[PDB]
């Protein structure tokens, strides 16, 4: 084996991240303005815009969830707060008209009660929210939820970064599989644990397990530009979950921060010291970006442009687009 | 598939940019001073110097087109202005003696009238000027022009970055095919849409469709050094179109700008906010470089040196030269 | 041969370093808190924590060796001092309770006497401490020690970076093989001699020679993050030796240094001018990191997290984990 | 073809530079202090140290040639000065005892007279000094010299970067072949002409043509560290020619330059504007490094260390050593 040892499987793959690829233009009669950006969030739920906001306490509370739904996407309410408060945020969103909303739950002792209070509050999507879903406890929680409240509520499981893990979630009954172990902008799992999977390869592998079962893949983490959304969807994802790209918006939690004459907002991992109070996330800042509506417009604008270049009339068509791999120089 | 999924065609190629390759020296009895730098701009038009200036409003108006033609190249007048003004710039150039000149047209509602006014003004080359020529409207415009005024005017179509797109333009009747989707120095399509094709690979692919039909390829975008011109031509292109490399010259539109004691000129994408007034270009600055004549001398000087090292007596010979691929370290 | 010449073996392999790979998550029912971090230092000695401190005079004297042993690892006392002083440091450590301790010896004229004084002082591990163990003198020293005092003392040999060198040490009787030629943070062998071997590949190759004989591999040098420890062990190493990561701790030799309002400690190669008084190491500084106990907690915390993600209940299981290779972009 | 087009030979090879490889350690009983560093400069001339100084006017005049010869290497006197002055510098060197000296000649109108005046002055080596030796005029000059004065004077030809070019020089009668097109530290040929060949691959290819005919290869350009000398020789070169590494020494031409409290000397390409008065070199500065004797000691010290690690008792043995290819991360 050229990289060492005698086992070809020790280094199992070459992992590509968003920056490693570009979408190839293709024959097109699709105008960006006329592309259909709708896509499946879950088996049953289709969004007008294929974007959801991260379940993080510097990204999504009621104000963000409301704005996301109004923009045609959805918010996933974070779970770093008491059960009654999270359920009350669900109520606040559903009060704002017929708006879709999701909410994160863990697999700990209080997770089941949290999920039931969220169901009672009228949540549409429960996101079983972990860093490693390939685990009997996580799979059992997914299955239990789907068998208990699965007629009225869609159940997302995550996160995974391998084909086998995605397959396990599908088998457990997941209505969507969320992909991303290590790619988050505020993630230090890569350096702390030495664990991760570049996101283009992780999406390609997850989709290989999920698409044949009609289960949509949510690409979660590592998206830095509007172009990354197009790349994630072309790799086979049905939606993208965004943290950093939405953390600078007016609707995110947190105050404005002024440093060196420029405006920022705090953005922190849910595995950072501050969020937990061995951290696997940092506490950082992102530039202030203004109203969510405007950020989403620009992001969807880039997606539309990609659909124009690739001749993709729908997201389903975009999922069939081809990449070129680029070098460091490119 | 080593990079993920089960489809070998999902990642269709490995795309090289100019910085990924160098020209290999070869047996040579050609002195740089004695090389023949002439090359086909179109099927019928041969330039003394294989360089054309970008159809941009911070690069080519009448003054630049005149200087380019006098230097042995050609200018393509930009189309970000009323039809009567563009046609009047064509008249200004043709007034300066028997000078070649080209002009850009779109495929919008006013494009046909623009093209006819340009024909009436005595233009030699019409450039159907788009970001994505693999499109029925663009192909139809190319064909219509070629069938209507194609006896007296040469019709360039662009831009493309794939073999199939180049093939479609050839079939539509293009007299030259312009290659470049995403490589421009002021381009943000790569980040905004996630779309592009590294330019060496894009030229190799386009030439594979165009050369067998005797249709010249114009390499447009991404050329940063005189050496890139040699590389583009060796990859099979017949001419190169330059924006950034010519934007700093006295003959380009725009005022001198002084920042931190150094001189610059404004250089902006035609897809930037300022040019359009979701942008796919930026508004920037390039160092002031002095008279066009001197910049072209240096650029052709580098090309001549390359022809010396590779034993290329003509451009046609240079198109047969070989590359070495280099690593990040090199 | 694509990279030149006609000999495919001239460039013998593609060497990967820690930054070239990530651990892939795998099915897991292992909680980080419950993983077993114990591992073989030598054929006979098992540590609670798979970490040893470098035999360097800015890393390990008695204070560090005591703290390392108490944390469940071990210190290797450096040999840049008189024999009586080194032996006295061994005595100081053994005085602090039943604590494991190792000590470095060379292969020079005074090396045998040094090793016997260390044996008399009650050392548990002798580390034949060289930059190139594939050498008859080093192999002979290893063998002599193992045949003379090998019933009561374990003999480590190093350093190596190839399969053949590791094999030679095994055959000489080594109880453990230490791997690392050129990767140290303060190493300049790579630039001075042009010699080295990227550490993931070097570990994979050494383990291929050592594991089939039940000889543990110590990964020495190049570990910058807690995640690198997990990577080294997954590549097949049984323990990791750390210099830079432990040099900033309270227990390391040397004074606190204040520059630009921040705290540092001196950290220098044993091949630096200052340590020797043609240098193959530099004299540098590392940030002050506080008590050893806390640094080890964080490092083991990262290892535990990796064992969680990879479903490794023990180190032996972690040694079977798989990598993904990443690009420069990732 | 994965990188574009249908011609596998268009991109002829993957070129490696010094930074792309490291020497693998090997079984060794060679102490650095006892290695034999002698090597063939030409078919007939063997140096004690395998290093020659560049024929540049900021590197080698009489003072440098004398110091190089005394250190066991050789200087090649530059040719950017009148014939009588260059010949007089040869006389100055031969006056300093039995010291080897070389001198550059071109292939221009005054080149033959220059070569004869140098022969009359007692030169030992004539270096036919060009940027592209694969040319009938250069090959003819080499042959003419070898047939005219080749009994008493050794004739070096260069520079080349391909197997075919090296083969042509061998056939012309070269006593040594000098390799390097584009790698020099002050070289801009790569950017100006887009022409070059990474030096490890260029040496491997040249050696493949030269070694079977017993013609030594001189590695010229791109050597930044003492370790690069070992790498060049292991790739098959017999000696290395150094410019930048020797330009900072007391014996180089030029004054001391003080900028920002640090000492420098001027170092400029022979293709820079200043040396010629379309430039293919820059005018720069290198740190002042003190006496040549000390720089050579450090450089040979690194070479010796490499011979120690690779078990090379002689240079001839070092030429058989193996590389590992490294990634950007390494
Ligand atoms: C098999 O048993 C296990 C397996 C794994 C863990 C780790 C774990 O649960 N956490 C808590 C969540 N974070 S995170 O906030 O930083 C995070 C949040 C969402 C997405 C992530 C994606 N990649 C990295 C971190 C992510 C990481 C550490 C575990 O802990 C008990 C037990
Ligand atoms: C299939 O239907 C489509 C397909 C594509 C588009 C995009 C489009 O027409 N534009 C306007 C031109 N720009 S540009 O100025 O930035 C530009 C100018 C020239 C060369 C370029 C090369 N690569 C990138 C940008 C370039 C990009 C956006 C579209 O819009 C209606 C409709
Ligand atoms: C075959 O004969 C030989 C072979 C090799 C050597 C070199 C040698 O012994 N030394 C002394 C030790 N250093 S070091 O302190 O920098 C060092 C310390 C530990 C680990 C290292 C890992 N990689 C690099 C340097 C390392 C390098 C130079 C030699 O010298 C007489 C004789
Ligand atoms: C086939 O006919 C030819 C072919 C080639 C040339 C170029 C040429 O002779 N020169 C003059 C020498 N320089 S240089 O000083 O910069 C130089 C000096 C030594 C080593 C070099 C290695 N790589 C780059 C530059 C180098 C480059 C330009 C030519 O000119 C008439 C005619
Ligand atoms: O602390 C953390 N460490 C690692 N990943 C995190 C952490 N907090 C949230 N995440 C994940 O990172 C995603 C946001 O990634 P981003 O959009 O690149 O900033 C989130 O949706 C989570 O999946
Ligand atoms: O706004 C823009 N975005 C992307 N490409 C542009 C834009 N404006 C012009 N171009 C293209 O970029 C080329 C100039 O590239 P440059 O020489 O690298 O600066 C032009 O000839 C166009 O093909
Ligand atoms: O001077 C030196 N040059 C090269 N390697 C050294 C030197 N001193 C110690 N080492 C090795 O570098 C290791 C520490 O590497 P680090 O943890 O990356 O700093 C040590 O355990 C030695 O194996
Ligand atoms: O102006 C120049 N342009 C390109 N190469 C040059 C020039 N002048 C000298 N050289 C070559 O560069 C070598 C020195 O390379 P260096 O040791 O990397 O600085 C010289 O021996 C020449 O072969």
PDB file of N, CA and C in Angstrom, chain A residues 327-330, chain B residues 14-24 231 323-330, chain C residues 2-3, chain D residues 3 11-17 20 181-182 190-191 194-199 201 325:
ATOM      1  N   UNK A 327      -7.661  21.669  -7.831  1.00  0.00           N
ATOM      2  CA  UNK A 327      -6.433  21.575  -7.053  1.00  0.00           C
ATOM      3  C   UNK A 327      -6.331  22.763  -6.103  1.00  0.00           C
ATOM      4  N   UNK A 328      -5.301  22.744  -5.262  1.00  0.00           N
ATOM      5  CA  UNK A 328      -5.024  23.847  -4.346  1.00  0.00           C
ATOM      6  C   UNK A 328      -4.881  25.177  -5.083  1.00  0.00           C
ATOM      7  N   UNK A 329      -4.275  25.139  -6.269  1.00  0.00           N
ATOM      8  CA  UNK A 329      -4.052  26.355  -7.043  1.00  0.00           C
ATOM      9  C   UNK A 329      -5.365  26.986  -7.497  1.00  0.00           C
ATOM     10  N   UNK A 330      -6.324  26.148  -7.875  1.00  0.00           N
ATOM     11  CA  UNK A 330      -7.600  26.629  -8.380  1.00  0.00           C
ATOM     12  C   UNK A 330      -8.455  27.282  -7.311  1.00  0.00           C
TER      13      UNK A 330
ATOM     14  N   UNK B  14     -10.624  16.009 -13.288  1.00  0.00           N
ATOM     15  CA  UNK B  14      -9.749  16.765 -12.407  1.00  0.00           C
ATOM     16  C   UNK B  14      -9.365  18.026 -13.168  1.00  0.00           C
ATOM     17  N   UNK B  15      -9.803  19.189 -12.697  1.00  0.00           N
ATOM     18  CA  UNK B  15      -9.615  20.398 -13.475  1.00  0.00           C
ATOM     19  C   UNK B  15      -8.344  21.124 -13.091  1.00  0.00           C
ATOM     20  N   UNK B  16      -7.513  21.404 -14.091  1.00  0.00           N
ATOM     21  CA  UNK B  16      -6.274  22.150 -13.895  1.00  0.00           C
ATOM     22  C   UNK B  16      -6.421  23.604 -14.300  1.00  0.00           C
ATOM     23  N   UNK B  17      -5.799  24.482 -13.525  1.00  0.00           N
ATOM     24  CA  UNK B  17      -5.772  25.900 -13.861  1.00  0.00           C
ATOM     25  C   UNK B  17      -4.354  26.232 -14.337  1.00  0.00           C
ATOM     26  N   UNK B  18      -4.118  27.481 -14.731  1.00  0.00           N
ATOM     27  CA  UNK B  18      -2.817  27.837 -15.282  1.00  0.00           C
ATOM     28  C   UNK B  18      -1.689  27.526 -14.306  1.00  0.00           C
ATOM     29  N   UNK B  19      -1.913  27.782 -13.022  1.00  0.00           N
ATOM     30  CA  UNK B  19      -0.862  27.588 -12.025  1.00  0.00           C
ATOM     31  C   UNK B  19      -0.502  26.108 -11.803  1.00  0.00           C
ATOM     32  N   UNK B  20      -1.334  25.199 -12.303  1.00  0.00           N
ATOM     33  CA  UNK B  20      -1.086  23.762 -12.153  1.00  0.00           C
ATOM     34  C   UNK B  20      -0.088  23.196 -13.155  1.00  0.00           C
ATOM     35  N   UNK B  21       0.276  23.957 -14.186  1.00  0.00           N
ATOM     36  CA  UNK B  21       1.135  23.413 -15.228  1.00  0.00           C
ATOM     37  C   UNK B  21       2.264  24.362 -15.615  1.00  0.00           C
ATOM     38  N   UNK B  22       3.313  23.799 -16.195  1.00  0.00           N
ATOM     39  CA  UNK B  22       4.357  24.587 -16.841  1.00  0.00           C
ATOM     40  C   UNK B  22       4.593  23.981 -18.208  1.00  0.00           C
ATOM     41  N   UNK B  23       5.039  24.807 -19.154  1.00  0.00           N
ATOM     42  CA  UNK B  23       5.489  24.324 -20.456  1.00  0.00           C
ATOM     43  C   UNK B  23       6.867  23.683 -20.354  1.00  0.00           C
ATOM     44  N   UNK B  24       7.001  22.481 -20.905  1.00  0.00           N
ATOM     45  CA  UNK B  24       8.295  21.821 -20.996  1.00  0.00           C
ATOM     46  C   UNK B  24       9.113  22.383 -22.149  1.00  0.00           C
ATOM     47  N   UNK B 231       0.691  29.392 -21.898  1.00  0.00           N
ATOM     48  CA  UNK B 231       0.021  28.181 -21.437  1.00  0.00           C
ATOM     49  C   UNK B 231      -1.336  27.997 -22.099  1.00  0.00           C
ATOM     50  N   UNK B 323       2.959  19.930 -21.497  1.00  0.00           N
ATOM     51  CA  UNK B 323       3.010  20.442 -20.132  1.00  0.00           C
ATOM     52  C   UNK B 323       3.637  19.462 -19.163  1.00  0.00           C
ATOM     53  N   UNK B 324       4.164  19.990 -18.056  1.00  0.00           N
ATOM     54  CA  UNK B 324       4.385  19.184 -16.855  1.00  0.00           C
ATOM     55  C   UNK B 324       3.416  19.689 -15.788  1.00  0.00           C
ATOM     56  N   UNK B 325       2.767  18.779 -15.065  1.00  0.00           N
ATOM     57  CA  UNK B 325       1.885  19.197 -13.979  1.00  0.00           C
ATOM     58  C   UNK B 325       2.715  19.377 -12.712  1.00  0.00           C
ATOM     59  N   UNK B 326       2.467  20.447 -11.963  1.00  0.00           N
ATOM     60  CA  UNK B 326       3.271  20.696 -10.775  1.00  0.00           C
ATOM     61  C   UNK B 326       2.439  20.588  -9.505  1.00  0.00           C
ATOM     62  N   UNK B 327       3.130  20.489  -8.377  1.00  0.00           N
ATOM     63  CA  UNK B 327       2.458  20.381  -7.090  1.00  0.00           C
ATOM     64  C   UNK B 327       2.364  21.756  -6.438  1.00  0.00           C
ATOM     65  N   UNK B 328       1.680  21.811  -5.300  1.00  0.00           N
ATOM     66  CA  UNK B 328       1.568  23.039  -4.517  1.00  0.00           C
ATOM     67  C   UNK B 328       2.936  23.613  -4.160  1.00  0.00           C
ATOM     68  N   UNK B 329       3.894  22.734  -3.869  1.00  0.00           N
ATOM     69  CA  UNK B 329       5.229  23.171  -3.477  1.00  0.00           C
ATOM     70  C   UNK B 329       5.944  23.893  -4.616  1.00  0.00           C
ATOM     71  N   UNK B 330       5.759  23.403  -5.836  1.00  0.00           N
ATOM     72  CA  UNK B 330       6.431  23.969  -6.994  1.00  0.00           C
ATOM     73  C   UNK B 330       5.918  25.348  -7.364  1.00  0.00           C
TER      74      UNK B 330
ATOM     75  N   UNK C   2       5.882   8.383 -13.950  1.00  0.00           N
ATOM     76  CA  UNK C   2       5.243   9.699 -14.102  1.00  0.00           C
ATOM     77  C   UNK C   2       5.980  10.841 -13.414  1.00  0.00           C
ATOM     78  N   UNK C   3       6.745  10.562 -12.362  1.00  0.00           N
ATOM     79  CA  UNK C   3       7.450  11.630 -11.655  1.00  0.00           C
ATOM     80  C   UNK C   3       8.917  11.698 -12.063  1.00  0.00           C
TER      81      UNK C   3
ATOM     82  N   UNK D   3      -7.688  14.991 -16.936  1.00  0.00           N
ATOM     83  CA  UNK D   3      -7.411  16.419 -16.790  1.00  0.00           C
ATOM     84  C   UNK D   3      -7.794  17.195 -18.044  1.00  0.00           C
ATOM     85  N   UNK D  11      -0.131  16.319 -21.064  1.00  0.00           N
ATOM     86  CA  UNK D  11       0.495  16.545 -19.773  1.00  0.00           C
ATOM     87  C   UNK D  11       1.403  15.338 -19.556  1.00  0.00           C
ATOM     88  N   UNK D  12       2.689  15.564 -19.795  1.00  0.00           N
ATOM     89  CA  UNK D  12       3.669  14.503 -20.031  1.00  0.00           C
ATOM     90  C   UNK D  12       4.167  13.837 -18.763  1.00  0.00           C
ATOM     91  N   UNK D  13       4.080  14.549 -17.640  1.00  0.00           N
ATOM     92  CA  UNK D  13       4.578  14.053 -16.359  1.00  0.00           C
ATOM     93  C   UNK D  13       4.078  14.873 -15.187  1.00  0.00           C
ATOM     94  N   UNK D  14       4.303  14.349 -13.991  1.00  0.00           N
ATOM     95  CA  UNK D  14       4.029  15.075 -12.762  1.00  0.00           C
ATOM     96  C   UNK D  14       5.381  15.495 -12.205  1.00  0.00           C
ATOM     97  N   UNK D  15       5.657  16.794 -12.169  1.00  0.00           N
ATOM     98  CA  UNK D  15       6.992  17.238 -11.814  1.00  0.00           C
ATOM     99  C   UNK D  15       7.112  17.531 -10.334  1.00  0.00           C
ATOM    100  N   UNK D  16       8.104  16.911  -9.700  1.00  0.00           N
ATOM    101  CA  UNK D  16       8.390  17.133  -8.286  1.00  0.00           C
ATOM    102  C   UNK D  16       9.554  18.083  -8.088  1.00  0.00           C
ATOM    103  N   UNK D  17       9.433  18.939  -7.082  1.00  0.00           N
ATOM    104  CA  UNK D  17      10.523  19.835  -6.717  1.00  0.00           C
ATOM    105  C   UNK D  17      11.124  19.318  -5.406  1.00  0.00           C
ATOM    106  N   UNK D  20       8.908  18.503  -2.447  1.00  0.00           N
ATOM    107  CA  UNK D  20       7.964  17.393  -2.602  1.00  0.00           C
ATOM    108  C   UNK D  20       8.474  16.064  -2.060  1.00  0.00           C
ATOM    109  N   UNK D 181      16.004  24.453 -15.700  1.00  0.00           N
ATOM    110  CA  UNK D 181      15.318  25.469 -16.490  1.00  0.00           C
ATOM    111  C   UNK D 181      14.130  25.955 -15.674  1.00  0.00           C
ATOM    112  N   UNK D 182      14.258  27.180 -15.160  1.00  0.00           N
ATOM    113  CA  UNK D 182      13.242  27.766 -14.308  1.00  0.00           C
ATOM    114  C   UNK D 182      13.271  27.658 -12.783  1.00  0.00           C
ATOM    115  N   UNK D 190       9.384  31.112 -15.170  1.00  0.00           N
ATOM    116  CA  UNK D 190       8.163  30.402 -14.919  1.00  0.00           C
ATOM    117  C   UNK D 190       6.942  31.323 -15.136  1.00  0.00           C
ATOM    118  N   UNK D 191       7.022  32.535 -14.646  1.00  0.00           N
ATOM    119  CA  UNK D 191       5.879  33.419 -14.767  1.00  0.00           C
ATOM    120  C   UNK D 191       5.858  34.211 -16.032  1.00  0.00           C
ATOM    121  N   UNK D 194       6.102  31.058 -18.747  1.00  0.00           N
ATOM    122  CA  UNK D 194       5.255  29.920 -18.400  1.00  0.00           C
ATOM    123  C   UNK D 194       5.980  28.597 -18.588  1.00  0.00           C
ATOM    124  N   UNK D 195       7.310  28.657 -18.610  1.00  0.00           N
ATOM    125  CA  UNK D 195       8.152  27.506 -18.928  1.00  0.00           C
ATOM    126  C   UNK D 195       8.955  27.084 -17.715  1.00  0.00           C
ATOM    127  N   UNK D 196       9.073  25.780 -17.498  1.00  0.00           N
ATOM    128  CA  UNK D 196       9.927  25.284 -16.435  1.00  0.00           C
ATOM    129  C   UNK D 196       9.770  23.789 -16.264  1.00  0.00           C
ATOM    130  N   UNK D 197      10.539  23.242 -15.335  1.00  0.00           N
ATOM    131  CA  UNK D 197      10.475  21.838 -14.988  1.00  0.00           C
ATOM    132  C   UNK D 197      10.934  21.705 -13.544  1.00  0.00           C
ATOM    133  N   UNK D 198      10.052  21.229 -12.649  1.00  0.00           N
ATOM    134  CA  UNK D 198      10.448  20.995 -11.253  1.00  0.00           C
ATOM    135  C   UNK D 198      11.722  20.159 -11.164  1.00  0.00           C
ATOM    136  N   UNK D 199      12.605  20.515 -10.240  1.00  0.00           N
ATOM    137  CA  UNK D 199      13.993  20.078 -10.315  1.00  0.00           C
ATOM    138  C   UNK D 199      14.257  18.607  -9.971  1.00  0.00           C
ATOM    139  N   UNK D 201      12.290  16.008 -10.698  1.00  0.00           N
ATOM    140  CA  UNK D 201      11.919  15.301 -11.924  1.00  0.00           C
ATOM    141  C   UNK D 201      12.915  15.599 -13.050  1.00  0.00           C
ATOM    142  N   UNK D 325       7.540  10.628  -1.114  1.00  0.00           N
ATOM    143  CA  UNK D 325       6.878  11.847  -1.573  1.00  0.00           C
ATOM    144  C   UNK D 325       5.957  12.353  -0.468  1.00  0.00           C
TER     145      UNK D 325
END
